[PDB]
Symmetry: C2
Subunit: 174 residues, 2 copies
């Protein structure tokens, strides 16, 4: 049987769940308990973290503009997602999605991570660019597991303290 | 590094490769050698086969209309893909994509199949609806491996002969 239901108009679905896309992630999963994690992400979001996904991530910026802050070698990069753009991210490339515009919508498709394959969430220093803190987690829900992790980073100056130059990361204000 | 390149406008990409989408599949893969198999499928295609994918398949009918002939229990069903519709197909649900309109375009995303996980391609009888022929293959390319398989079915009345009522499947004319 069609465990995930019949086909349905996507633009309409987005219009109807627009009000449900809220910070910090701006996340909303389309189907539950599926191998393909299909989500729509809107704005304005609030991400100061760099995600380290063990698998690839597909992007299709349907509405509005957004961009991904990245690290390509050891340098911070910016990959813009102009409305209409699609993009496939190689596994493990560090990325921090910046979605500043309201009414924005990007289709993001990922995969359920196999047991033992963990996701990483990182923060780097503004000053020396050194790694400040990293949390590895067996990701069970890209919609609910995230906010709690960030909150623990923001609630601790010890986690935010750069082990290289001692600078304390701005927390939820960077 | 961005092994798959930078983001790019999708509508434009489709406009530029429109002429490359041809029968029987109407297939075109966006990125090569990736875990996520991202393809755009246009029309008019020519499919008389039912695909048995061991993994899920994501659909997003971007341009035009199409439909999937299915089997939901033992009955032939039809799941329409109206322009704008998205759909996630559970693994193994038998489906035969019918894409009759030219200039049509549907985003189809699947996964690279792990060794040992085979794909099935089937044909059923018009008369008794019984299974007429099934080929299992370690799918290495949903863009090039398909046509050769179908051609062998069409070139053999023995493969097309229903083991239940003896009716010979119409081949590439059903
Ligand atoms: N790319 C994202 C995004 C995003 O693109 O906004 C949000 C959540 C997660 Cl888990 C991601 O991997
Ligand atoms: N759904 C499809 C389609 C399709 O939707 O047209 C084409 C090729 C393959 Cl291998 C598929 O699984
Ligand atoms: Fe990510
Ligand atoms: Fe520092
Ligand atoms: Fe299929
Ligand atoms: Fe028959």
């Amino acid at each position: 049987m069609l465990t995930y239901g019949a086909p349905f108009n996507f633009p309409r679905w987005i219009d109807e769940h627009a009000h449900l896309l809220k910070p910090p992630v701006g996340n909303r999963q389309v189907w539950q308990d599926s191998d393909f994690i299909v989500t729509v992400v809107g704005g304005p979001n609030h991400r100061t973290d760099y995600h380290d996904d063990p698998l690839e991530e597909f992007f299709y910026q349907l509405r509005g503009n957004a961009y991904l802050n990245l690290w390509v070698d050891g340098r911070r990069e910016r990959a813009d997602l102009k409305e209409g753009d699609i993009f496939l991210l190689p596994p493990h490339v560090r990325h921090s999605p910046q979605r500043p515009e309201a009414g924005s919508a990007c289709l993001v498709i990922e995969r359920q991570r196999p047991a033992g394959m963990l996701d990483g969430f990182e923060w780097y220093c503004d000053a020396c660019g050194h790694l400040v803190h990293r949390v590895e987690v067996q990701l069970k829900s890209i919609v609910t597991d995230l906010p709690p992790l960030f909150e623990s980073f923001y609630a601790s100056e010890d986690k935010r303290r750069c082990p290289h130059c001692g600078q304390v990361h701005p927390g939820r204000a960077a």
